[PDB]
Amino acid sequence: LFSSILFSIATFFSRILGLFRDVLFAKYFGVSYELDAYFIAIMFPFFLRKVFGEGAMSSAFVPLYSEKSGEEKDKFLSSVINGFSLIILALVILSYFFPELIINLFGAGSSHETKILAKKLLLITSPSIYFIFLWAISYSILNTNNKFFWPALTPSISNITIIIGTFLSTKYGIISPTIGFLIGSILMFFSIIKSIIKHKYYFTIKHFPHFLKLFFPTFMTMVVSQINTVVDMNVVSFYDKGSISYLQYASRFYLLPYGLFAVSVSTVVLSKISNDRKNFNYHLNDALKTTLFFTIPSMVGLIFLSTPIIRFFYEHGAFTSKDTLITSKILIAYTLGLPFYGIYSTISRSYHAIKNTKTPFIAATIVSLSNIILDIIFGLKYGPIGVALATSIAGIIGVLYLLFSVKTFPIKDFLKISLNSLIMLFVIYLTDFTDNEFWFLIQILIGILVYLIFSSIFYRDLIRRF
Ligand SMILES: [Cl-]
Ligand SMILES: [Cl-]
Ligand SMILES: [Cl-]
Ligand code: NA
Ligand SMILES: [Zn+2]
């Protein structure tokens, strides 16, 4: 629909801007115990943000808010706000009085100086949760009114404040981007405060229990799917200092091709399932093909060009050649799972599309359990790269479960796409001559052209018919 395209525009801007935030992190801080500390401090809010944000709450909030009429709707809203305010307040109190609990939750293995600094920053990040939660509620209200572009854009506020703090980091140090994180949350809330403050306030949580009853199922899938990144970070804290920062650089960069190829391309087609349930198996079939068509070649390219890509974006200022080597290898480790997490995401969102919460949940559980196990075994011994690989392998396991669940997969088109991807690989390999920092961009363009040529050869009849 119109709102999906608009949503992609808003999200695209916010994520590219986010990338610039990370790039400046590499420039001004590189890999350091202090950036580790900053990451630990912001993880708790960010964990909460990612869980609730981008309309996660909406799924349960929309039906219960929109249905009500009169000032019972206003009462409902106030009930939710008050309830969450209670939980949040408890959290912030606990944070201030037992910061070692929070620190150990996210960075148990980090060094002494890192933990001290992370406490200091925690004092600044803790209040952000309240504003993030209010931002999430406000967001939902907007979704009831079918406004999607501007809410989707608000994350850019946070990115700009953090960026600015990074620019001021040469004057104030690590605390500047932390205060920027805080202020960023505040301005994100104020940007859409009107959706909340127009209604009246009632001193009650009367409807909060019902809201929790309905919300809980979507909450559990968000927690389980997200908890993995917390586990990854926690585990790598036990490796040499700077590991958290390595993993954050690699994963934040990795989230661009994942978000673009493993999720976004499959959105449009997936919409059909919601409107045409009777043909789910057929529609799902198509979706999978779409996913593969993008994820398999990308992976190849990303792996073949991981080092030059990483060097182009990150190797400035404090970020050093050693950091490029290490981060590039981590990025490969994540990228090996790209097609598997694409398939995973497609099947999961389709099941969600036919009102099935059980299977996506179970798959999430398998992936999370596997990732914790493999993070222990491989992460502790082999550090960041081991953690990333654990994530990818876990993805493979989840894919096997889901594939045995839906009992359908486009084998023929998988083979054709893999073949075209290896032709592409062969051509880009042959063209690896100049060894110039800017050469990889050309190599991507060449690769795209090769891949589309041979795809058009192997899909001639499909292009003609359509
Ligand atoms: Cl950040
Ligand atoms: Cl209710
Ligand atoms: Cl009710
Ligand atoms: Na992992
Ligand atoms: Zn109620």
Residue numbers in the entry: 4 to 469
What are the paper's exact sentences on this?
MurJ consists of 14 transmembrane helices (TMs), of which the first 12 are organized into two 6-TM bundles termed the N-lobe (TMs 1–6) and C-lobe (TMs 7–12). The N-lobe and C-lobe enclose a central cavity that is large and highly cationic, properties consistent with Lipid II transport. We determined four crystal structures of MurJTA: one structure in an outward-facing conformation to 1.8 Å resolution, and three structures in inward-facing conformations distinct from the published structure, resolved to 3.2, 3.0, and 2.6 Å, respectively.
Based on the conformation at these regions and the size of the membrane portal, we assigned two of the structures as inward-closed and inward-open. The Cα-Cα distance between Ser11 (TM 1) and Ser267 (TM 8) increased from 8.0 Å in the closed structure to 17.4 Å in the open structure. Superposition of all the inward-facing structures show that they align well at the periplasmic end of the protein, which highlights the importance of the periplasmic gate in stabilizing the inward-facing state. We observed systematic rearrangement of Arg24, Asp25, and Arg255 (Arg270 in MurJEC) in the cavity between the different crystal structures. In light of this discovery, we re-analyzed the Na+ site in all our other MurJ structures and found electron density in the inward-occluded and inward-closed structures as well, albeit much weaker.
